[PDB]
Design a protein around this ligand. Structure first.
Ligand SMILES: Nc1nc2c(c(=O)[nH]1)N[C@H]1C(S)=C(S)[C@@H](COP(=O)(O)OP(=O)(O)OC[C@H]3O[C@@H](n4cnc5c(=O)[nH]c(N)nc54)[C@H](O)[C@@H]3O)O[C@H]1N2
Ligand SMILES: Nc1nc2c(c(=O)[nH]1)N[C@H]1C(S)=C(S)[C@@H](COP(=O)(O)OP(=O)(O)OC[C@H]3O[C@@H](n4cnc5c(=O)[nH]c(N)nc54)[C@H](O)[C@@H]3O)O[C@H]1N2
Ligand code: SF4
Ligand code: SF4
Ligand code: SF4
Ligand code: SF4
Ligand SMILES: [S]
Ligand SMILES: [W+6]
Lengths: 214, 967
């Protein structure tokens, strides 16, 4: 299948990926307000499949450690969201056998949506209050099967976002990890044998987000 | 198959926001006959390779936007309602206003009897957002009507750069280009937040880092840029010249300068005359009564033929280099560390990393944008960067340069087209009242008698004449010269600039204002005053994408429409993807873009609006006569149109220029009607027209070179990313300016692994050589009179060497480097009720006043409201918690914002007292969105530099207080 490699040591939090995701799918904007942070929307939602999370950590000397985390479905190799949904109705959550994309369908309205969300170790699924359908990042599977990069990968200016076949992406992640460790000794890959969106964190992944890793 | 893009026609465009110049692909429904259905990055474009920041990435939402204007709106005097009117009504009535105002105000001679042929009762703002062809047509329409008060954005963020870099190198432009940043070994970002304000630039900045470059951010705040640099060095606001002066001293003390480059290609060897001196913070020739310098005291000593004397041994005591060493010996580390607030350890780290690029096999670049270069001595800030780069051999080389980042998509182009009061297109000056003839105009150009000095500006009479032929082809240039307006020689130049325009408006001295593609009701400093001053206009014409705080100033905060007599016309223009034309990016790439969807509703491209407007003015003059009709009646507008529409192609070919008769020039024969192949073949006798000599070469008989999308590169071109066949850059496709300095006098690169040009088999290979001639036969700075990169720059008003003068008036009382505290050639109140230093800056997600991006729900989504960024120390002092509502106030006004308490802001220690900075985005305005807040310019003063005419937006005094709600 396919895989993302997300090198957070290169991210400028430009949020091009956040906007590109909504442009490609023509998703609505949420009502937001500033509550003391550049982060917005504050959370994933039925209409927000990716948001960049901002976290500031003190450090000795000038400046801060500013941690940016563009969150999205991890497209798990063995997705528990599918395992939970299959209890109520098979076909609500399916897996693309070519790309590895985990895909929610309109049949998610016919399964226990809250239990599907609680089954996810990354707390990724979001429910529409009206229809009870679930939504999340779909890997831009449409674009991928037609030879295009995912919208958020294509738009990224920094090389944070990388996308390709899982073997080239895993080899890249391993080589980038070794290099990034020379500046960030605490750098790690997030659950790299279990997911298709492999983040390189420059320190404790939970400093980026409480659900950054399982 | 992707349904979304099925049946839609794909076209290319260029982002309409910042000056990086990213490429887009637009898909338009019904095979081009419907609306846009998708906009994203062009994967083939060499600058962004498909990447877009959120502003570029949301252009679909900008264009396909039901909040856009749909047709002209009219606001009658004292009315509280817009009335929708036809284009014919709006343009006919505007033409009538123009003509009535011009007829009543036109002055043939000024009060001294000198010919000026101008109207002072109309002013125009705008715009870097129009296409290059529209900018060029617009300025010529304005000047044909007699206007002199012609300004736009460039006055603020671009105008300081031009004299600073022109003094140093001969040209004011960014010297390299975006792709070239990846060749750098050390990138100093100072006065720039490029990761937020030129985001795709960090593609190339991080690629340099991938190849081993050190990235350094020098900034008072920790930003999204700082997060990704190797070194973040905080600097106190306004302490940049001490920082750079310390670096000059470091370079000189440690012999880190590139001697061979310095000796041959800078003015290090020139002998300064004995009248030059510096004492107690003042250069010689100071006139205390008028606070001005007699610059002739700074002259070089000249030889028999008038050429500055040189000591190539660099031993003479009055050699520039030796005067340089003496000047900067005061800038020792401990004094610089004290004033900058940068630790001595960090100063040493930065200085060592950056000065290592004086080796020929290493290249260093400096990136700066707007920063705080607008105060009295911002030009000297830039001068110091230029001097550092010359000492290190970094000018002319790949990964080097002074990368003065342009702001807006076409601010390079709109400046190139002379949308500033002091310049015609092609940087030919607007004549003053004592240039009574074309011959007197041409006589002002300095000449050189050094046979190695190209002194290319000696060709100016060709460019002036060809420009006059472009406007008035049936007239002799000496005759046409009398058609255009002149400014007064007696007045200070800044009387015609941005800030004095708002001042004269507040005094009721303008009857009409064009706000063309700008939002002055938010963008001008001291917004309360400017909003009130707009009420003193008889009429206001606003051309814009959306209704906005300027168009609707009469119903803004605290306004009573029934008391405001101004007549307003709102003319909705179309977005960038709905029209064809070019925009010139920061690296001077003049890139052609195409229409996707047709103009939304009844919106029109700027070029059609202005041409129809001008044609109606012409018709009124042909029927009624009036003041001096000839400049209007005779203007060549036939060349601007085709198929009864404004023609970007025909205007671009006229700006390039063409032959008006069979002509012999440069040893070749040309036929009437042929495009001029380069500005080398322009003439002064009327054989050629050219709307802008810098464009001569962009659109030749070979076709539209701006429209090239050719990635072909030789190995040496591709090694440094020139992409010479992708679009076209002025001048004549020289991608890296001053590249003759990149080689020795046999023509071999100082750095063969990153060669820019090389002498091979009797020709220069690589980039286009900046200045023809055999290796070792020409000085490398061809636009300089003397031919050298200027370490010593005697044309500057503040002195030939940058010197620290405190730009922070209120909290500083001591200058450690001289007894001269403030700029000696330059009235803040410093009321103690406003003890904090307010500043304004940008965030990635919004654009300028936010007129455009506050209308884009995805960008509002990410940044919905004005906020105020403060330190933990200040939040503690004032009892402010993160996310609290605060009131920020100044002597000028007050607003509320959401507090953002962060360690990204830290107090400045100034003279043993903590001084707190308060950060505000200027992206907001009362019109939209709900609860977004208003402009940070409610707080800013309308006082600016005597000498630059720029208002203070980076350091102004404020108070910040918690706003309480119910327990
Ligand atoms: N996202 C976005 N990008 C933009 C724009 C926008 O509105 N939004 N505007 C465009 C335009 S028109 C312009 S002109 C450019 C402006 O480009 P920038 O100059 O990058 O814009 P700023 O954010 O206003 O100021 C940049 C940095 O200068 C720092 N600074 C303030 N005072 C000083 C000082 O005294 N010394 C030093 N060394 N630094 C200081 C500020 O803290 C800030 O981080 O950006 C262009 N790009
Ligand atoms: N406090 C503070 N004030 C500042 C600054 C600051 O840093 N701080 N920065 C200053 C600087 S550097 C600048 S650049 C100015 C910006 O000042 P403005 O130019 O007045 O700001 P905007 O109107 O928001 O710029 C966007 C404009 O482009 C117009 N536009 C887009 N496309 C087109 C088109 O095709 N045709 C026409 N006619 N119009 C079009 C939109 O309608 C919109 O009005 O603000 C200045 N003021
Ligand atoms: S587009 Fe790339 S650099 Fe920008 S926020 Fe997303 S991942 Fe980070
Ligand atoms: S892969 Fe596609 S759906 Fe997922 S975050 Fe990126 S743009 Fe959104
Ligand atoms: S991250 Fe959660 S929602 Fe996404 S595939 Fe894994 S279990 Fe399913
Ligand atoms: S705003 Fe600047 S960096 Fe962003 S997409 Fe447009 S040109 Fe590129
Ligand atoms: S600009
Ligand atoms: W600007």
């Amino acid at each position: 299948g396919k895989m993302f490699f997300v090198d957070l040591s290169r991210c400028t939090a430009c949020r091009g990926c956040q906007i590109a995701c909504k442009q490609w799918k023509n998703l609505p904007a949420e009502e937001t307000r500033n509550t003391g942070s550049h982060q917005n929307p504050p959370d994933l939602s039925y209409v927000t499949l990716k948001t960049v999370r901002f976290t500031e950590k003190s450090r000795k000397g000038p400046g801060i450690d500013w941690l940016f985390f563009p969150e999205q479905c991890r497209h798990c190799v063995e997705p528990p969201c599918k395992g939970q949904a299959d209890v109520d109705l098979e076909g609500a959550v399916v897996k693309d056998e070519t790309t590895g994309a985990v895909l929610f369908t309109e049949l998610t309205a016919k399964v226990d949506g809250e239990s599907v969300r609680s089954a996810c170790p990354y707390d990724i699924p979001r429910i529409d209050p009206v229809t009870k359908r679930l939504s999340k990042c779909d890997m831009c599977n449409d674009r991928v099967q037609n030879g295009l990069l995912p919208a958020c990968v294509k738009t990224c200016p920094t090389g944070t976002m990388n996308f390709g076949d899982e073997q080239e992406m895993l080899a890249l992640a391993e080589k980038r990890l070794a290099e990034v460790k020379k500046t960030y000794p605490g750098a790690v890959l997030g659950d790299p044998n279990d997911v298709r969106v492999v983040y390189l964190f420059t320190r404790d992944p939970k400093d980026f987000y409480e659900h950054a890793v399982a | 198959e992707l349904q979304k893009l099925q049946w839609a026609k794909q076209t290319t465009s260029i982002c309409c926001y910042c000056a990086v110049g990213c490429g887009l692909i637009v898909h338009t429904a019904k095979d081009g006959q419907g609306r846009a259905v998708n906009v994203e990055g062009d994967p083939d474009h060499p600058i962004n390779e498909g990447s877009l920041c959120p502003k570029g990435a949301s252009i679909f939402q900008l264009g396909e936007n039901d909040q856009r204007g749909t047709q002209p709106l009219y606001r009658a005097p004292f009315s509280d309602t817009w009335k929708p009117v036809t284009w014919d009504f709006a343009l006919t009535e505007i033409a009538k206003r123009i003509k009535k105002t011009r007829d009543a105000s036109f002055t043939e001679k000024n009060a001294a009897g000198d010919l000026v042929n101008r109207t002072e009762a109309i002013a125009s703002f705008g715009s870097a957002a129009m296409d290059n062809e529209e900018c060029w047509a617009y300025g010529n329409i304005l000047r044909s009507l007699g206007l002199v008060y012609i300004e736009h954005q460039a006055r603020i963020x671009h105008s300081p750069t031009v004299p600073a870099l022109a003094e140093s190198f001969g040209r004011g432009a960014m010297t390299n280009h975006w792709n070239d940043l990846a060749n750098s070994d050390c990138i100093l970002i100072m006065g720039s937040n490029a990761a937020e304000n030129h985001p795709i630039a960090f593609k190339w900045v991080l690629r340099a880092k991938d190849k081993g470059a050190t990235l350094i951010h020098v900034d008072p705040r920790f930003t999204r840029t700082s997060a990704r640099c190797d070194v973040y060095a905080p600097i106190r606001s306004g302490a940049d010249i001490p920082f750079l002066g310390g670096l000059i001293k470091y370079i000189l003390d440690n012999k880190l300068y590139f001697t061979d480059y310095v000796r041959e290609y800078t003015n290090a060897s020139l002998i300064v005359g004995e009248k030059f001196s510096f004492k107690d913070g003042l250069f010689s020739g100071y006139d205390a009564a008028n606070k001005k310098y007699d610059k002739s005291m700074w002259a070089f000593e000249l030889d028999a033929n008038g050429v500055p004397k040189r000591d190539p041994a660099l031993k003479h005591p009055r050699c520039v280099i030796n005067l340089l060493k003496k000047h900067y010996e005061r800038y020792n580390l401990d004094k610089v560390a004290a004033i900058t607030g940068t630790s001595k350890e960090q100063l040493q780290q930065v200085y060592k990393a950056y000065a290592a690029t004086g080796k020929p096999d290493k290249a260093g670049t400096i990136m700066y944008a707007m920063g705080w270069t607008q105060h009295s001595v911002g030009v000297q800030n830039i001068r110091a960067m230029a001097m550092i780069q010359l000492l290190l051999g970094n000018i002319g080389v790949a990964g080097g340069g002074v990368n003065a980042l342009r702001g807006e998509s076409n601010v390079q182009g709109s400046t190139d087209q002379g949308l500033l009061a002091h310049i015609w297109p092609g940087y030919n000056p607007v004549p003053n009242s004592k240039a009574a003839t074309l011959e007197l105009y041409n006589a002002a150009t300095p000449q050189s008698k050094d046979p190695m000095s190209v002194n290319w500006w000696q060709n100016r009479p060709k460019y002036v004449a060809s420009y006059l032929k472009a406007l008035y082809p049936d007239e002799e240039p000496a005759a046409a010269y009398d058609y255009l307006p002149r400014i007064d020689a007696g007045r200070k130049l800044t009387d015609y600039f941005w800030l004095n325009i708002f001042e004269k408006m507040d005094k009721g001295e303008f009857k009409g204002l064009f706000a063309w593609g700008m939002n002055p009701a938010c963008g001008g400093a001291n917004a309360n005053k400017n909003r009130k001053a707009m009420g003193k206009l008889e009429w206001l014409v606003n051309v814009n994408l959306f209704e906005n705080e300027t168009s609707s100033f009469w119903k803004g905060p605290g306004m009573n429409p029934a008391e405001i007599g101004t007549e307003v016309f709102f003319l909705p223009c179309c977005v960038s993807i709905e029209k064809e034309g070019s925009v010139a990016n920061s690296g001077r790439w003049m890139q052609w873009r195409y229409r996707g969807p047709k103009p939304y509703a009844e919106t029109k491209p700027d070029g059609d609006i202005m041409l129809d407007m001008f044609k109606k003015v012409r018709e009124l003059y042909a029927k009624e006569g009036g003041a001096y009709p000839a400049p209007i009646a005779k203007l060549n507008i036939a060349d601007w149109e085709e198929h009864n529409e404004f023609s970007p192609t025909k205007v671009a070919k006229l700006m390039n220029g063409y032959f008006l008769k069979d002509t012999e020039v440069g040893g070749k024969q040309f036929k009437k009607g042929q495009q001029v192949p380069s500005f080398a073949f322009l003439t002064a006798d009327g054989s050629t027209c050219s709307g802008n000599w810098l464009h001569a070469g962009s659109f030749t008989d070979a076709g539209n070179l701006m429209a090239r999308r050719d990635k072909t590169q030789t190995p040496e071109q591709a090694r440094i990313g020139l992409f010479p066949n992708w679009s076209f850059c002025w001048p004549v496709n020289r991608r890296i300016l001053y590249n003759r300095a990149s080689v020795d006098k046999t023509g071999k690169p100082w750095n063969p692994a990153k060669a820019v040009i090389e002498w091979k088999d009797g020709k220069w290979v690589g980039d286009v050589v900046d200045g023809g001639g055999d290796p070792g036969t020409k000085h490398p700075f061809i636009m300089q009179t003397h031919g050298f990169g200027a370490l010593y720059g005697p044309g500057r008003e503040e002195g030939p060497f940058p010197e620290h003068y405190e730009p922070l008036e209120c909290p500083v009382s001591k200058n450690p480097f001289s007894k001269q505290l403030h700029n000696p050639v330059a009235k803040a109140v410093c009321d103690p009720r406003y003890p904090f230093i307010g500043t304004t800056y940008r965030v990635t997600e919004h654009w300028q006043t936010g007129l455009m991006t506050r209308r884009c729900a995805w960008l509002v989504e990410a940044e919905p409201q004005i906020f105020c960024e403060i330190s933990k120390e200040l939040a503690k002092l004032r009892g402010i918690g993160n996310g609290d509502t605060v009131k920020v106030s100044s002597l000028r006004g007050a607003l509320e914002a959401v507090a953002i308490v962060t360690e990204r802001i830290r107090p400045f220690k100034i003279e043993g007292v903590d001084v707190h900075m308060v950060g505000l985005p200027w992206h907001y305005g009362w019109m939209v969105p709900k609860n977004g807040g208003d402009t940070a310019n409610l707080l800013t003063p309308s006082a600016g530099d005597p000498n630059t005419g720029i208002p203070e937006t980076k350091a102004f005094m404020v108070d910040v207080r918690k706003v309480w709600s119910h327990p």
